[PDB]
Structures are given as C-alpha cells and as structure tokens.
C-alpha cells in the first residue's frame, strides 16, 4: 500500500494511488534513451466525472490508464490538462481524444508540443502567460510559476484537499540531480519554486512529476538540487 516505485511497475501497466478524498495519482513507467523511468499524473473527482492531469507517458500506457480508472473508480474522464509539452505529459493525448476526453494545455505548451513533434492538446488555456497567474479549471486551480523544468510548466492545486501537484517543476526528496534538464531554466527555477511556496503555503501533500509524494519539503529540496546542478 506504499507508493509504487519504478521497479514495481512494468512498462505498459498503470497503478492508481489514493492521495485524498476524490484525489488519486496515476503512476506508469516508460523507456527513454535506454533507461526506464516512472512518472506521475493526477485524477480529481469533478462530481460524477473526472478531471485528468497529464497522460501516462505514451499511447499504450494511456489506454491502460483509462482501463485502470474504469476498473478502480468507474467514472468517466471528461477533460484532461497537460502541464507541459514533453511526452510524459502529452504522449497519449491522441488516445484521450479518441476516448471522448477534451484535452487542454496552455498556448505555450501547444506551440512547444507542435514544434517538437509531440501530441497536441486540442484546447488552449488562456490566462496563464505571466508568472504568478492562476485560473480555475473544474475542481482545481492551475498556476504558472515561471520557467523551471520547462518554460511552460504548470502547477495544479486541489483546494478541497490541499494537494499540490507540482509536475516536473518539483522533484522527489530522494532526487540527487534535477532530472531531465534539456529544456529547463536552472537559473530561474529557484525563483519559480519560491513563487509556488508563497502561493500555496497550506499545501499538505506535494506530488512531483516523477517519484514519491511528500510534504512541502519537496519544494525546498527541489530548489536545493537545482542550485547544485547549475553549479
Ligand atoms: C520525456 C522527458 O523528456 C524530457 O524531459 C526532455 C526531452 C528532450 N528531447 C523525460 C525523459 C526521460 C527522463 C526524464 C526525467 C527524469 C526524471 C527523474 C530523474 C531522476 S533525478 C534523481 O535526476 O530527479 C531523471 Cl534521471 C530523469 C524527466 C523530468 O525530470 O521531468 N523528464 C524526462
Ligand atoms: Zn518534462
Ligand atoms: Zn517529467
């Protein structure tokens, strides 16, 4: 009943983890450049429907996600938000779009996904283009903290449960490096994390884009590992 780790999930299977009432994470694994990585997303109950945050990193993983949701929860996924343009966030959007899910991302994410050759969410989320912006989306708040892991990364807060989903701007406590920094801004990242800390001081659970949830310490730890990576 502990949170599931990379070696416990074969590539292609998806597990769900109950975070709070009406809030789950989803965990899947994928191969990239010859190594296997876990990744997280979020599911938030929206009355008799579900809001999905992020794909399960690939088409077959995302199909498996939908099946796992049907088995474990049994409510329809009606909308999905992708929190940046990388394949661990948008790979699977075409599966979602063929299963009746309306897919959303910021215009910045949509442009970057298109330029990269990744799958492209259908609908643009306006109101998020300046750092510190926040908008409501069903049962969550979407927040743009500034450039961090990527220039487009969004953060999601579930106010009913004080759950902060940091996405790939936030690392797990065991991390020793800042993950895949190919598209990152290591210089701005600590400032962006500080904006998150200031905006969401009552967060009780913090979920990283990859690895184990914890508390607010994940934010400071992230700042620490990024500053040492830049060095
Ligand atoms: C699909 C994604 O592509 C990119 O990001 C740039 C693609 C450029 N064409 C990706 C592919 C493969 C791996 C990742 C990782 C990752 C996460 C955690 C760790 C452990 S640790 C202790 O370093 O935190 C590591 Cl090693 C990597 C992350 C992330 O950091 O969000 N994104 C990853
Ligand atoms: Zn990424
Ligand atoms: Zn990531």
List the structure tokens of 165: 């989903």
- CATH architecture label of 6-230: 4-Layer Sandwich (3.60)
Do 93 and 127 form a contact (C-beta atoms < 8 A)?
Answer: no
Ion ligand 2: residues, CB < 5 A: 86, 168
> What is the C-alpha separation between 167 and 143, in angstroms, rounded?
11
Going by their DSSP bridges, the two strands 205-208 and 163-167 should be labelled as parallel
Helices (H), 76-205: 87-90, 93-98, 107-116, 189-199
Catalytic residues: 84, 86, 88, 149, 180
Closest Cα to atom 4, ligand 1: which residue? Answer: 180
Closest Cα to atom 30, ligand 1: which residue? Answer: 179
Query: Which value in Å is the resolution of this experimental model?
Result: 1.2
Q: Give helix 217-230 / helix 189-199 axis angle, nearest 10°.
A: 170
Domain locations in the chain as residue ranges: 6-230
List the structure tokens of 127: 């109101």
**Cα of 18 from ligand 3 centre, angstroms:** 21
* DSSP-assigned letters across all residues of 156-176: EEETTTTEEEEETTS--TT-S
Residues 6+ apart with CB under 8 A from 132: 143, 144, 145, 146, 195, 199
**Cα of 209 from ligand 3 centre, angstroms:** 5
Residue 215: closest CA among 175, 173, 157: 173
Closest Cα to atom 23, ligand 1: which residue? Answer: 179
> What is the C-alpha separation between 139 and 22, in angstroms, rounded?
10
Do 28 and 65 form a contact (C-beta atoms < 8 A)?
Answer: yes
104 pocket-lining for ligand 1 (C-beta < 6 Å): no
List the strands of the sheet with 134-137, edge to edge.
Answer: 134-137, 140-143, 155-158, 163-167, 205-208
């Amino acid at each position: 009943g502990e949170y599931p780790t990379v070696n416990e999930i074969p590539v292609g299977e998806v597990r769900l983890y109950q975070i709070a009432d009406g809030v789950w994470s989803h965990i899947a694994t994928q191969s990239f450049d010859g190594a296997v990585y876990p990744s997280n997303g979020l599911i938030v109950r929206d009355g008799d429907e579900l809001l999905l945050i992020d794909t399960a990193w690939g088409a077959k993983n995302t199909a498996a996600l939908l099946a796992e949701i049907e088995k474990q929860i049994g409510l329809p996924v009606t909308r999905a938000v992708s929190t940046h343009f990388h394949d661990d966030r948008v790979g699977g959007v075409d599966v979602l779009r063929a299963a009746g899910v309306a897919t959303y991302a910021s215009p910045s994410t949509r442009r970057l996904a298109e330029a990269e050759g990744n799958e492209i969410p259908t609908h643009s989320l306006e109101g998020l283009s300046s750092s510190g912006d926040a908008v409501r989306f069903g049962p969550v708040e979407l927040f743009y903290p500034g450039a961090a892991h990527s220039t487009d990364n969004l953060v999601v807060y579930v106010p009913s449960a004080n759950v902060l989903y940091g996405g790939c701007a936030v690392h797990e406590l065991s991390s020793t490096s800042a993950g895949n920094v190919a598209d990152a801004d290591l210089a701005e990242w600590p400032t962006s994390v500080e904006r998150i800390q200031k905006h969401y001081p009552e967060a009780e659970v913090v979920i990283p884009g990859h690895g184990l949830p914890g508390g607010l310490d994940l934010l400071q730890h992230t700042a620490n590992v990024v500053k040492a990576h830049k060095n």
